[PDB]
Amino acid sequence: GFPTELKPGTNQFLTTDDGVSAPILPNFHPTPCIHIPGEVRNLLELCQV
Amino acid sequence: GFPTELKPGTNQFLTTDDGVSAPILPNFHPTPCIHIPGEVRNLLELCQVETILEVNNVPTNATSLMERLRFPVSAQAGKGELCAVFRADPGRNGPWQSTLLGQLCGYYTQWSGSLEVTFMFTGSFMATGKMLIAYTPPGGPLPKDRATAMLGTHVIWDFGLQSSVTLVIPWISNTHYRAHARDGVFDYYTTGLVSIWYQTNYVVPIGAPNTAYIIALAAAQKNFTMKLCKDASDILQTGTIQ
Amino acid sequence: GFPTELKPGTNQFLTTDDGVSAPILPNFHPTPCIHIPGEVRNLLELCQVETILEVNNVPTNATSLMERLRFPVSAQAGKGELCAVFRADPGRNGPWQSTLLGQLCGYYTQWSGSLEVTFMFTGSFMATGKMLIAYTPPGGPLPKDRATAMLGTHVIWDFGLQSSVTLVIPWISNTHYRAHARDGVFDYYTTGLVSIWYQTNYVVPIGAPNTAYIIALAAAQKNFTMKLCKDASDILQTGTIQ
Amino acid sequence: ATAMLGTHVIWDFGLQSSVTLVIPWISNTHYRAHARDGVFDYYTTGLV
Amino acid sequence: SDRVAQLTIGNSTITTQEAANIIVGYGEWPSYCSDSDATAVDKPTRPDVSVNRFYTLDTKLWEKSSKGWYWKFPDVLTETGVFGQNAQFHYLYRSGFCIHVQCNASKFHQGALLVAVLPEYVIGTVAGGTGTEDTHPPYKQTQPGADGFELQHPYVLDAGIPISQLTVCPHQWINLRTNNCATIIVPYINALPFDSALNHCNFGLLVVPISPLDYDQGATPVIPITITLAPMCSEFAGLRQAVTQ
Amino acid sequence: SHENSNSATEGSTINYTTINYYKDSYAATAGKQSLKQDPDKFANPVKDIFTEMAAPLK
Amino acid sequence: SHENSNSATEGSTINYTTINYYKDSYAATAGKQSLKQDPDKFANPVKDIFTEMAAPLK
Amino acid sequence: GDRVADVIESSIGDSVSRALTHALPAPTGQNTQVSSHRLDTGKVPALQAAEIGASSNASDESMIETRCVLNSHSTAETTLDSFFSRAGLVGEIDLPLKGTTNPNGYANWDIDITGYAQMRRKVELFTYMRFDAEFTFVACTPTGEVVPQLLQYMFVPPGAPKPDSRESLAWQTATNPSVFVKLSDPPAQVSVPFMSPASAYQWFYDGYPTFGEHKQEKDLEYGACPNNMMGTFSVRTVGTSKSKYPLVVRIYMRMKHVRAWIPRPMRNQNYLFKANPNYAGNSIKPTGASRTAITTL
Amino acid sequence: LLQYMFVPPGAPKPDSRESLAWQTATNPSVFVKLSDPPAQVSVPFMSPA
Amino acid sequence: EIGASSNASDESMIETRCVLNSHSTAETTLDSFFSRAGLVGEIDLPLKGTTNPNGYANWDIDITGYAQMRRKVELFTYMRFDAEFTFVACTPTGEVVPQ
Ligand SMILES: CCO/N=C/c1ccc(OCCCCCN2CCN(c3ccncc3)C2=O)cc1
Ligand SMILES: CCO/N=C/c1ccc(OCCCCCN2CCN(c3ccncc3)C2=O)cc1
Ligand code: NA
Ligand code: NA
Ligand code: NA
């Protein structure tokens, strides 16, 4: 196989790590998103109320 | 070697993971594929094929099982009497379990689309009659009489040369998809009820049987789709299969 | 390091896996390859070379082993008598085991193609005769007489200057490939039978032997191929080889 | 089952009151003389 | 104009004045085996008109209590006419079929037969009732010949599968008030280009009453069901002596 | 790539989009299939097709 | 790549398609071979070749 | 050369099977069109003739007044690969210490996936299937424990010598493919090609494998087709002495690159044996739930 | 060694360590050792709404 | 007698049809046949034993001690090749120990 070497951090579970994980339902498509009023994008929007 | 770092999930075996695995027979070439009739590409193709709906799902002893495939109609006393009823829920215990649609439906968590039931009259050519077949959307209880049933979606069937009629159970839902309905909070996904009434009467002349049968065939419309693959509720094995 | 995640198969040693392994001698250069006659590229090249078929696979004591390589013909009483028979199945126990084709065949699970058997007459120049060699495709039992054998694929051989004749056992199968046939459900892959009969008679004048021998040579046609590499049924070792 | 092996028609009663059986010319000779018992049965046409 | 029909093939012609169209199984017509699908090298024999014709093999009596019957193909024909001879003399065989099931009654009779074609129709046994005995169906039940065989438990098609879903297979119904026959055309169905007509039955023909026959005392009580069928595009190869099994 | 075409679906009516790291293509992933359908093959295999508006038997 | 040509098949009549990660090519995979064949070398090594239709000895 | 007219105008030999239908792209469910009231004579969508053998062609639009609905519900999860490419249990092998079955430290498993109902019922929806597959082997002790033990798995195709002991010469595995793995390593996993001599495997074979009389004692071979028998899967603990622990190997199969032909009714009675569709005659049950009357829920 | 299985509404819930439902022919399952790093997967938006 | 194999073909011995043969010849190449790992040597390092009770062992590199492999290579007289050697170690019971 291709030569690799494991580095520290290997096997750890960091709760804020933004990685990729295998999908459990292949080819699954979610229910379309209809329009819903009041969508919020940033908590800062609420801090101004 | 090249610096790498193992992440969670490492070593796990996910049954639905679509990965690559080492081939056991290098340079092996399979037998060519000749032409074979009836190839299927999508289960949805099968959901559009009508199969017999066991509206008359009451007899249970072995020698009477075939009677579930058809239900009767006969001369009445013109009071717009009730002939039969059944839930329209396709993935629910009941009549739909006899259909291929109901069974394939069991391998999916959610479904969406219109359904259709075609009724074929098998009485003699000399028998006539008009039936009212109604579909009552959610919220409406079992119609007490024909006048109540008539307020919902319905078809008035006239016996004649064309032996059959089709009742379309149009997709009328609050959600885009329904999960399988059952007693309890999941009745939220119920499709509704179907009731059959005598519009006029089964009329016949001297010499023809006073009782005849109707065979119901059901399937899905072209707007029907299913999602979220799951295991069927039945597992057809008791002990080990030898 | 770079984020990676180990998948099933990790650490396994698959004997047929075609991967890369660290070299033990860096910068080592092998002895150049001079020209050597007879290089082979594909086992199929060898399957087309005729080797002796032991039709007469009956004698078993050491001093009579050489007799398996040839079978006899001799003056008869003109009743179209039977000379010899054998199964055409190349990867089956029997006569074909003596051939290189049969042996190489043992390293593959499936085969496909036509076969050929060439018979060489080794009697005296003054001996003449006509033989009927027949191939009976699957389903036909061992022909009871010459008239039955004659209904299948056959060749009528005339002894003369050309010492030999070739019987082609054309590929006539229901499946594209046959697995090795043997008694039991795998007889489904049987190739058929080959029977040799006296068409006329072995005739000779005063002074020449009344018995002569035929040597059979077999190999595969050019449409022959094999697939699904497997281990041979024999392992030529009893205890440890010292 | 034996009759069915020859030329035949399967007739279904209905609106069309009739059906036609064609007795196609199937002879060894170009012409047939009148058939009768004896050597002249050589010219027989067959059975229906 | 859809109720009337004529089927002519070989030296045989069928007529019907109460048809319900024609079903072409899996949407495709019978055809001969192509040079790229084929594998056997001998030139086949394609007898044409002497084997591709209508054969009327059997008649069953439909009764108020009938359970249904089945026939196996090409088994039903292996001993009939020039077709049978070819099937016996050759190892390899392939063909399509035109099946025409007939049953007429009167405008005062009633009932409905489901006529379907089920490929690779493997028969099972009741396993000694308790399911502990591993019994197997006898030769006369798996390949009943021209007489066909009566179903023991039609609801599960004597094979543990629901007849309620049999309509997923090419089929037609004979609903007495509507039509008096069913016509189904079937192409060759197998995972091999050719096969043995003796050892392997490509499909079974099922004729089962779903809505029972009925009529009033006085109407003709004998209502026959006749089976007529024609091979289409028959091909044979691997010639030798005749073999019946 | 430059691999053997030994996948079970080689020469199929629908095209797949898969991933692989070996010389034999049957080692590849299942991938995404093409979404074609032919319901009529099973639901409407009649010789003479009739309309929706018409009376099926005439 | 820019590796040593020390494979056992360097300079062979048939070309291979292999994979490797080291500077020595003998470390490479077996790969796919070229499908050439020469049966005659063993099955028909006669000086004066005869036809199929002809009588081999005349 | 030909000359008589009937030969010239012959269709004998036509190899192109004429198809009455063709596939169309359908990535989403069909949309709904606006429809209005129709009060016509002659036009009659609701009336059908099931006898013909086709399913109803009546649509929502012609049975009720409909609105327009743009349906973008996907049809991707109902493709054959979506339905079948999910690994399920198809075999189990026991390697006990002091036991009745395999007390010799090795075992031969006949490659047949019909011993488990979930998987079997799914594949039996079709008559013919052609596919490649990914097999995964999960090993552990009967309590689910992981121990430092080395195993050897070997695929023995029909005709190759089956090992008859933990020390059989056949484990030299010079040609058969073998996998050596520890119980502590992740589950072993490999890709398997489509290996039948036929163009497809078939879950049903209505016939016999050989010619001859099909008498009582041979009826066990009715329905047996060698084109479905791919061989033996053998496993052994790698050693000359008995292993210290009892092992269990679970075999999972995940089909991929699937093609299927001829759909059939789905099994509605419990399975009893691998080799056949036998059902318990005294327990024939209805396909589904039942009720007391046709006029009540 | 453990087995995790996702059982969507309508699929049979295992009623024991030996339930037939663990055959998991359609439901997604994960087989992992306690000694392996934490199992991890991606889940899509699955509501009917 | 000439020493060549028969040149007679199906086409000239019987009436044949046309068959488009696309059966591959790839699995019978030398690499396909030989590039499958097989047992060629075994080394014992026992504790209290007759042979190697000293914790080390010398194996003469000769693969002819095992019949399966030997018979395959002996089909040819001369062979030139590279090779991948794999070493599987464990105790006599198949156990894995921290050694
Ligand atoms: C190092 C060894 O690794 N090899 C593992 C292996 C796994 C599977 C394998 O072949 C699996 C073929 C699965 C085919 C299952 N089929 C085909 C049809 N069939 C069947 C069974 C009963 N009746 C009819 C058909 C089946 O049971 C070969 C090797
Ligand atoms: C860190 C050490 O790793 N090195 C491992 C190693 C493995 C193999 C190796 O050389 C293997 C050469 C195999 C050649 C086998 N042959 C060549 C021909 N031959 C033979 C034997 C008996 N009679 C005639 C020829 C053989 O037995 C060298 C080092
Ligand atoms: Na993950
Ligand atoms: Na792998
Ligand atoms: Na390495």
Strands B2-6 and A4-6, how do they pair?
Answer: parallel
Q: What is the resolution of this structure in A?
A: 2.7
φ/ψ of residue H77, rounded to 5: -80, -5
Residue C147 DSSP SS3 = helix
- Scored b (16 or more CB within 10 A) or e, E193-219 reads bbbbbbbbbbbbbbbbbbbbbbbeeeb
Nearest-CA neighbor of C50 among C100, C125, C11, C93?
C100
Longest dimension (CA), chain B: 96
Q: Report which DSSP code applies to C178.
A: E
Please count the other Cβ atoms lying within 10 Å of the Cβ belonging to residue H114: 18
Question: Contact H66/H33 with Cβ under 8 angstroms?
Answer: yes
Q: Which residues of F touch H62 (CB under 8 A)?
A: 52
How far is the C-alpha of H248 from the C-alpha of E198, rounded, in Å? 44
Is E47 an interface residue toward H (CB < 8 Å)?
no
Q: B120 has which bridge partners?
A: B164, B215
End-to-end CA distance of chain A: 58
CA distance E224 to E177: 16
Separation of B16 CA from ligand 4 center, angstroms? 15
- The residue of chain F with its CA nearest to that of B22 is F27
Which of these, E17, B165, E170, B118, lies nearest to F55 by C-alpha position? B165
CA E23 to chain centre: 14
Tokens of E58: 């059997």
Count of domains for chain H: 1
Nearest-CA distance from A49 to chain B in Å? 33
Which alpha helices (DSSP H) does chain C contain, by range? 43-47, 100-105, 146-149
Cβ contact B67:B56 at 8 Å:
yes
CB of residue H179 inside a 6 A radius of ligand 1: yes
Classified by CATH at the fold level, domain G1-58 comes out as Rhinovirus 14, subunit 4 (4.10.80)
In angstroms, what is the span from residue H169 Cα to ligand 1's centroid?
A: 24
Backbone conformation region of residue H61, classed left if phi is above 0, alpha if psi is from -120 to 50, else beta:
alpha
Domain coverage including residue H90: 1-297
Element (H, E) at C13: strand C13-14
> Which atom of ligand 1 is nearest the CA belonging to H195?
12
Backbone interruptions in chain E following residues (C to N > 2.5 Å): none
Find the ligand nearest to A3 CA: 5
DSSP strand pairing (B108-112 vs B225-229): antiparallel
Q: What residues make up the domain containing B126?
A: 1-242
Nearest to B237 by CA among E161, I14, H268, H289: H268
Q: Enumerate residues 6+ apart whose C-beta is below 8 A from D4.
A: E54, E55, E56
Chain B residues within 8 A of E176 when measuring between CB atoms? 122, 124-125
Residue ranges of chain A whose CB lies within 8 Å of a chain H CB: 25-29, 32
Backbone angles phi, psi at B140, to 5 degrees: -85, 125
Cα of I38 vs centre of ligand 3, distance in Å, is 10
Please give the full DSSP string across J55-95, using - where no structure is assigned. S--------TT-HHHHHHHTTSS--------------TTSB
Provide the 10 A C-beta neighbour count for residue B128. 16
J43, J49 in Cβ contact below 8 A?
no
Angle (CA) E54 E55 E56, round 5°: 120
Quick one: which atom of ligand 1 is closest to the CA of H251? Answer: 7
In the three-class reduction of DSSP (H, G, I as helix; E, B as strand; rest coil), residue C146 is classed as: helix
Here the CATH number for the domain that contains residue B225 is: 2.60.120.20
Which chain H residues contact residue C8 at CB under 8 A? Answer: 136, 186-189
Do the beta carbons of residue D2 and residue E80 sit within 8 Å? no
Q: Taking ligand 3, which is a single-atom ion, which protein residues have CB atoms under 5 Å away?
A: A 21-22; B 9; I 40
Collect all residues with Cβ–Cβ distance below 8 Å to B43 and sequence separation of at least 6. B104, B107, B226, H78, H79, H80, H83
CA gap J37, J40 in Å, rounded: 9
Give CA angle at D9 (D3, D15), nearest 5°.
140
Q: Give A-chain residues touching C4 at CB under 8 angstroms.
A: 4
Give the residue on A whose Cα is nearest the Cα of I45. A30
Contacts of B158 (CB under 8 A, 6+ apart): B129, B130
CA distance E119 to I37: 50
Question: Considering every ligand atom, which ligand is closest to the CA of A17?
Answer: 3
Determine whether the interchain pair J15/E40 forms a contact, defined as Cβ–Cβ distance below 8 Å: no
Chain A neighbors of I48, CB-CB under 8 A: 31
Q: Which residues line ligand 2 (CB under 6 A)?
A: C 24; J 61-64, 85
Q: What is the CA radius of gyration of chain H?
A: 27
A11 shares contact with chain B (CB less than 8 Å): yes
Edge-to-edge strands, sheet with H106-110: C13-14, H178-182, H150-156, H232-237, H106-110
Closest ligand, as measured to the CA of C21: 5
Q: Is I37 left (phi over 0), alpha (psi -120 to 50) or beta?
A: beta
B27 CB neighbours in chain J (<8 A) are 26-27, 29, 32
Backbone angles phi, psi at F10, to 5 degrees: -60, 125
Domains of chain F by residue range: 1-58
Q: Is F4 on the interface with G (CB under 8 A)?
A: yes
Long-range contacts of G16-21 (CB under 8 A, 24+ apart): G17/F2, G19/C20, G20/C20, G21/A2, G21/A3, G21/C20
Count C/J contacts: CB-CB distance under 8 Å. Answer: 104
Tokens of E222: 């004998």
Determine the Cα–Cα distance for residues H183 and B125; give it in Å rounded to an integer.
Answer: 72
Q: Ligand 4 centroid to E176 CA: how many Å?
A: 61
In chain H, which among 138-157 make CB contacts under 8 A with chain J? 148-151
Taking alpha carbons only, the member of B11, J37, C23, C7 closest to residue H180 is J37
| Distance between F38 CA and the closest CA of chain B, angstroms | 6
Q: Enumerate residues 6+ apart whose C-beta is below 8 A from B46.
A: B40, B100, B104, E168, F42, H263
CATH of the domain at H139: 2.60.120.20
Beta bridge partners of E13: D9, E8
| CA-based nearest residue in chain H for residue C240 | H169
CA distances for C196 relative to C73, C146, E241, angstroms: 10, 9, 16
Q: How far is CA A10 from the centre of its chain?
A: 20
* Closest residue of chain C to B15, computed from CA coordinates: C8
In ligand 1, the atom with minimum distance to the C-alpha of H137 is 5
Beta strands in chain H (DSSP E): 24-25, 47-48, 88-95, 106-110, 126-140, 150-156, 178-182, 188-192, 201-202, 232-237, 247-263
Q: Which of C7, E185, G38, B7 is nearest to J25 (CA)?
A: G38
| CB-CB under 8 Å, B33 with F11 | yes
**Could you give the domains of chain E?**
1-245 (2.60.120.20)
Token output for E48: 């044409």
Under 8 Å between Cβ of E25 and E187: yes
SS3 label, residue E45: strand
SS (H, E, C) chain B: CEEEEECCCCCCEECCCCCCCCECCCCCCCCCCCCCCCEECEHHHHHCCCEEECCCCCCCCHHHHHHHHCEEEECCCCCCCEEEEEECCCCCCCHHHHCHHHHHHCCEEEEECCEEEEEEECCCCCCECEEEEEEECCCCCCCCCHHHHCCCEEEEEECCCCCEEEEEECCCCCCCCEECCCCCHHHHHCCCEEEEEECCCCECCCCCCCEEEEEEEEEECCCCEEEEECCCCCCCCCCCCC
Number of separate domains in chain C = 1
Q: Do B8 and C6 form a contact (C-beta atoms < 8 A)?
A: no
Pairwise CA distance, residues C144 & H149, whole Å: 60
Q: What is the C-alpha separation between F41 and B44, in angstroms, rounded? A: 12
E4 backbone dihedrals φ, ψ, rounded to 5°: -105, 145
In the reported structure, the alpha carbon of residue B19 is separated from the centroid of ligand 5 by a whole-number distance in angstroms of 23
Q: Report which DSSP code applies to F4.
A: B
Which residues have a beta carbon within 5 Å of ligand 5, which is an ion?
Answer: C 21-22
DSSP at H183: T
- Angle made by CA atoms H249, H200, F41, in degrees to the nearest 5: 125
Please provide residue B189's backbone torsions phi and psi, each rounded to the nearest 5 degrees.
Answer: -95, 15
On whether any CB of chain A is under 8 Å from the CB of B43, the answer is no
- Ligand 5 center–CA A2 separation, angstroms: 9
Q: Do G8 and J81 touch (CB under 8 A)?
A: yes
Count CB neighbours of H53 within 10 A: 29
